[PDB]
């Protein structure tokens, strides 16, 4: 999930890794100890926030989503360029 409330909780980690709640602190401590993730969470209730990460293998849904979000970003920058430049070029030049 690249967007749409990336913030998560330990229920998915404990559910997918069949581990108890007392070991998730050592799990994220080892995750930060390896050095592949720099996740720092300022949570109050138990939550799981992550940071920069690399797939390193493959992602096809992120290639298609890369084309969708990339074309959306490009047409939005173009829409702002034509919007501002449209009348701005005619009134200021």
């Amino acid at each position: 999930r690249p967007a749409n409330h990336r913030q998560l909780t330990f229920e998915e980690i404990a559910k997918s890794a069949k581990i108890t709640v007392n070991e998730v602190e050592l799990l994220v401590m080892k995750a930060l100890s390896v050095g592949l993730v720099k996740g720092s969470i300022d949570e109050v209730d138990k939550r799981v926030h992550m940071t920069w990460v690399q797939p390193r293998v493959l992602d096809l849904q992120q290639i298609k989503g890369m084309k969708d979000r990339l074309e959306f970003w490009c047409t939005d920058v173009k829409s702002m360029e034509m919007l501002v430049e449209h009348q701005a070029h005619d009134i200021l030049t």
């Binding site: 920058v77 360029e81 430049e85």
Partner: peptide
């Protein structure tokens, strides 16, 4: 500020 959008576009 007007032409930069084309410079990147």
């Amino acid at each position: 500020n007007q032409v930069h959008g084309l410079k990147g576009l």
